[PDB]
Structure formats: C-alpha cells, structure tokens
C-alpha cells in the first residue's frame, strides 16, 4: 500500500434481559374458591415455577453487577476535570461520547450518541415503568401491558438503571484521554494510535508528518458510525429483536387464557353458573391442566433462553477486557481486519462496541526478497517488512506502507548460516 | 351493540335505552412488595406503579407513614434518597434500596471511581503522574 | 440445589393429581378395576410429566457445568502452566501467577497480584527530541528530571536510572509536542 485511511465498524452485544414475573394462582384461577380448592391437589407446580423464576432473575442481576464491576476495574479520574469545556485533545473530537452534564455531574449520564441510540426503542425499563404507570387513570385505549399486568404477568425493572451504566461507560471513555491515562498503559491517545498503527508495519515518519490527517480520518469515521443509525443497520435490528420476541412471548402466554382445552367454555364464571357442583369439577380440571402445561412450557423456554444471554454477557466482558482497556495479540477477535482500537458505549439491554481499523486505498507492485546472505555468509531477515532494490542499492520497506529505509540493526534478524535460496549480496556490511 | 378487539376481549358498550357509548376497563388486581429484615418487627411496603391516593382511597386504609417514589408508593419508610449505600440486601430496582438501622429508602451505588488531585494540562510538555 | 431437586421429585408421589387417593395400594379393593383404571391413569400422567420436567431441567443445567469445566481448563492452561498476554483474565489487577487445588465438585484457583501501597507525585514526559532531531520514547516507563538531568523511571516503581539504549525506542523524526533537549547525546 501507498495510501491508507481509517474505517469504523459497530457491533451490539446483549447483556441483560427483561425480568418477567408470573402469579400462579392469579393466572390459573381468578378470585374463585372452587378453583383454588381443586388446584390444591397440585401443590408443587406453582412453588417450583416461582423458584425457577427467582433463580432465573437472580443470575441476571448477578451478571449485571459483574459487568458493572468489569467496566470500572482500574478507572482513575482527576478531581479537576469537567466535561463542559474539556472535550477535545490532540485534534480528536469526543464531545458526543461523554456525559457529565450540569454542576453535579449526575442525573444525566447519557451522551448524544446514547440519546440517539435510545430514542429508537421505547420499551426500555423507563418505558415499562411509564407504561405501567398509565394503567390506573385515563380514558384512552386499553394497552396490552395493562391487561397483562392484571392477570399475573409483569415486567420488573433491573437493580441498576441505565443512567448508572451510562455514567460508568462515560468514565471508562474519559479515563483514556486525560492524565492519568489508566486505559492505555499510561500514554496519550494520539501516541497510542500512532504506536498501534506502526505495529502493523507502517513507518514512523509518515505518521509524524500526517498526524492531522489521521485525526481527521478518525473524526470522520466516528461521525459516520454516529449518523449511520438512521438506516437498516443490523445493530438496531438486534436491539429490536429481543423486545419483539419478549412481546410475542407475552402475547402467546396471555392468549392461553381464552382456550377451552376440551372443556365447554374458557371462562370459569360460565361453568360455575350453569353446571351443578358434582359435575362442574371436570372442565376446571382440564383448564387447570392446560394452563399448567402452558406455564411449564414458558418456564422451560425462558430457562433455555437465559443461558444464551449469559454467555453473550460473558463474551462482552471478555471483549471489554481485551479490546478496550488493552490490545491483545489476537487476530480477528475485536474486529475484522487490521485492528487499531475500540470504544464502548451503553445500549438498550447490552453494549455497543465501535472498532477502528486500518484500510489501504491504493497499492503499488514491487519486487521483494524474503532474506539476504552477506559477506560472512551471514543471513539477514526482515523484522516486519521486505527488502527491496532501489537505485541499485538494497534497502528495507514496510509491509503496510511503501517507504524505503536504509538497512540497520533495528529492523533485521541475524543468522549465523543463511538459507540456500537467499539472494547473494556480498557487498552489504553491517 | 358491542365493540370487541382483535383478540376477543370487550372494550365497548351501547345502552339501547339511553343511546350512550361506554367503555370497559378492569380494576386493579395487582400485587404488593414487602421488604423485611430479621432484626426488625414491622415491614416495608411497596405498591408498584400506584399513587398513594389510589391506595389510601380504594385499596385499603392504614395509619402508617407513606410517600411517593419513582417505583410507586412506599409505606413504613422515610425519604432519604440523598444517602448512598455500597452494600445492600433489600434491592427494589432502578437503583434503590431499603436499609435498616427504621427503614430508609436510599440509593444503590456499589462502584465509584477513585479521584486524584492532579492537573490535566501540560506545562512545558510535562504531566503530573503518581508513581 | 441437588438436594432440593431430589426432594421436590420425591414429593411428587404424595400428590393425588385429581384422583381419590394419592397411594396406589389404597384403591385396589374399594373400587373396581374398570373404575380404577381412570384413577391410575391420572397418577401415571402426573408422574410422567414430573419425570419429563426433571429430565429437561437436568439437561438444561448440564451445559452450565460443561462451560464451567471448559473455562477451568482454559484457566489451567493459560494461568497456571504459563502466563499469556491477557489483561484481567486470570485475576483482577497486575497478575503475577496462580496455583490450582482440588475442590469438592470443581477446582480452586489462587491468584497472586502486585498491589502498591504508597504513591509519589512526579512530573513526566512522554518523549524527547534530541540533537539529531531524533525522537526517543520510553518502552515501559517515563522520562523525569533528577539533579537537572534527564533520567528514566519505571511505571510501577520510582527508581531513577540513566538513559541507555536498552530502555528507549528511537525514531528518525520526533513529534511536534516532544520536549526539546538538544544536550542528551545517545
Ligand atoms: C500539541 O500541543 C498543542 C498545545 O496543547 C495542541 O494545540 C491545542 O490543541 C487542542 C486540540 O486540538 C486545541 O483545543 C487547543 O486550542 C490547541 N492549543 C493551541 C495553543 O494551539 C496541539 O493540538 C498538539 N498537537 C498534537 C499533534 O498533539
Ligand atoms: C424525597 O427526597 C428528595 C431528595 O431529598 C426530594 O427531591 C428534592 O426535592 C426538592 C423540593 O422539590 C428539590 O428542591 C430538590 O432539588 C430535590 N432533589 C433531588 C435530588 O431530586 C423529594 O422532593 C422528596 N419527596 C419525594 C416525594 O420524592
Ligand atoms: C492519499 O489520499 C488522500 C485522499 O485521497 C490525498 O489527499 C493524499 O494526497 C494522498 N497521499 C498521497 C501520498 O498520494
Ligand atoms: C400516559 O398518559 C399521559 C396522559 O397525558 C400521556 O401524556 C403519556 O404519554 C402516557 N404515557 C405512555 C407511556 O403511554
Ligand atoms: C336511539 O337512536 C335510535 C336511532 O337513531 C332511535 O330510534 C331511538 O329513539 C334513540 N333512543 C333514544 C332514547 O333517544
Ligand atoms: C441485629 O444486628 C446486630 C448488629 O448488626 C447483630 O449482631 C444481630 O445478630 C442482628 N440480629 C439478627 C437477628 O440478625
Ligand atoms: C377510589 O376512591 C375515590 C374516593 O372515594 C373515588 O372517587 C373513586 O371512584 C374510587 N375508585 C374506584 C375504582 O373505586
Ligand atoms: C466507593 O465504593 C466503596 C465500596 O463499594 C465504598 O467503600 C466507598 O465508600 C465508596 N466511595 C464513595 C465516595 O461513594
Ligand atoms: C489539591 O492540590 C492543590 C495543590 O497541590 C492544593 O492547593 C489543594 O488544596 C488540594 N486539594 C485537596 C482537596 O487536597
């Protein structure tokens, strides 16, 4: 390559899941004493369902606490640091990725990016709270959430609000741009980007001469990732998929209360008002059996689905540990291609990672040699690059940018015996 | 004479003797949250997504202190949302907790960032770092 | 959890499931076989449903311990026998090493970490630009001023050392915001 640029890629990883609670007695029966007296025979299904639901809901809170602890492992900020006038360093604009609005630096942690991401889906925790607060009062249409809440199915909010995870992501992002930089091994952001680019096979001269161009490309990639949401991107689809699946599951569970299941009617009122007691106890049994089967099926499906989001949250924690706070020698782990760095933000029921990659735009054909054999029959091999012949003189070039440099001891590997297919150059002394 | 939904429920009504259109809504059949500590004797009550007036006028009538919170109406607890607690055993949701000393409705802040008293600018090209 | 599951599975035999008696020997003389078949069918269906639910729960729970054992194998491979360049994998902090011991139905890892106890504030510089317009950058540490001389210090312990060629990285062109010191010949 002879010219390059920086591209950006977004990825969404799910961490949490809505907490659903079901009331066994209020679902199977409803204010009826005969139904309770008949259900008293099955004195184990309801307790087991409640125990399974509690065990499911506990692990989600535990995983959320683990993620919150992982996001702020070694974050150390400065006391004299406000975000109202400190938002750009080394020609890098990051105002759209930090919160801390107001004198108290609280009660508003979501930035412009997080606001734009949250304004797409309304069925968040605050959304569920505002929806359930509208069930008592008003002459508007009857929402499905209110008719579900009056039958036993209710969605509870998590133990940590999104405004707290936003304030953690904001601190994690700020800790990598101001001293002490406890997110990049103690070096400035621009120098870290320069070193990450040079580690791929790019010379330091082109990086020192084109720092402003790198900053402009980084800002353009960030703006593209920011304004690339008003489209058909897969991140918004993944965000909406969990909400749609939860809504469909709740609707399918609610529709189980209007099935006869072989009885004469789907309402216990019609049965207890037209049939004699010693014979009316046959249809209630079928209804109870059907409803218990539906509840068991829903519980099994939820228990099978929870492990997926648990492992997804584990993968998200690993990604935060090995891509954001540090860069590990792993290919195609953080992103596809030549990875430079990554940033993390909050998202409805999970995290959003933005990976920055190095992409060439123009190439040039050259002739290279894998190694050389020189005077003392001693072999020399390139460290990360190739050996070219320019102006009838062997020199060294990088593997990601064409810039000839003289052969020195800082970019070669010595061998006491050179291979049999090395170019014979007995005029190079080192 | 009637109005149904897309599922089979009943939302409408029309009285044929007065020519008036009415609607149908189900009344409250929710649940109550109770927080209890083994050292105390009373309970801390929480009616989720309910104003305290609707509880005192329609649900029941008690002689205990009450207030309105972000989650609902809280009974037998004072409003001390300006105090944070790191370790909590009574988690209610949305970053709230119930502590006992007498129940107090406080916030939940398990993790905080360590602050240092150093400058952020570079004077002469040097930074202030603790080693 | 295993004890509770076994107790819940055992308690299923004491339920009636809509029949007239929870036991099977009770209804063998007080009722005719043509009328006892319907009573036995309910118990059979209930017990089969309970067994199926227990089997499903166990099959769902096995994957968790499988993933845990895989993670334990990875931990033994990359934390005990060797140390891989991964941050916050074995433990939380500056990891040194780890040991493994046997634990009832699992394994126990003991990780040892490096924790400072006292700090000192100093003035550091990310790099220098020296005589031949050449840039020098610390590998893992900082450049400080001691006795009016440019020295090198570590990032985890304060110990001034003279600048040498085994703790710096050279660049033909120094950045625009590097400290100018045209006296450090190296
Ligand atoms: C080198 O340092 C100077 C001085 O701090 C930087 O200039 C500042 O850059 C920031 C970010 O673009 C601006 O907000 C300031 O207004 C600038 N101040 C002045 C006096 O120009 C410069 O950006 C740094 N260059 C590099 C490559 O790090
Ligand atoms: C409960 O306590 C909170 C915090 O003390 C009260 O919120 C304050 O209310 C006063 C008066 O309206 C305002 O001046 C403050 O700015 C509020 N502070 C915060 C942090 O919101 C709240 O009014 C009390 N009562 C209820 C019902 O919540
Ligand atoms: C690299 O490409 C950019 C944009 O097309 C251009 O401005 C710049 O001059 C190019 N550099 C070289 C060395 O051709
Ligand atoms: C609740 O009802 C009020 C009535 O004014 C309305 O403004 C608000 O948007 C409603 N909220 C939801 C979530 O439907
Ligand atoms: C209701 O409306 C119908 C048709 O418009 C009319 O025949 C009837 O008299 C009305 N009833 C009353 C009580 O006004
Ligand atoms: C009540 O609190 C005290 C002090 O924390 C403690 O010693 C005691 O065991 C507690 N009592 C119970 C029943 O937990
Ligand atoms: C609740 O009580 C108030 C005051 O007595 C009354 O106006 C209102 O109609 C009641 N609501 C219900 C649903 O009973
Ligand atoms: C930070 O959290 C720790 C433990 O959670 C707690 O001991 C400490 O008091 C907290 N600090 C502040 C300022 O809240
Ligand atoms: C922070 O440091 C400055 C200068 O060293 C000093 O004036 C100030 O009092 C310090 N503040 C605190 C809270 O220690």
Coordinates of C-alpha atoms in Angstrom, one line a residue, chain B residues 1-2 12-22:
Chain B
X1 CA -74.4 -3.1 20.2
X2 CA -70.9 -4.1 21.3
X12 CA -67.3 -1.2 24.0
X13 CA -70.9 -1.0 25.0
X14 CA -74.1 0.8 23.9
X15 CA -77.2 1.3 26.1
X16 CA -80.3 0.9 23.9
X17 CA -82.5 2.8 26.3
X18 CA -80.3 6.0 26.5
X19 CA -78.2 5.9 23.3
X20 CA -74.9 6.3 25.1
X21 CA -71.5 4.7 24.3
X22 CA -69.4 3.4 27.2

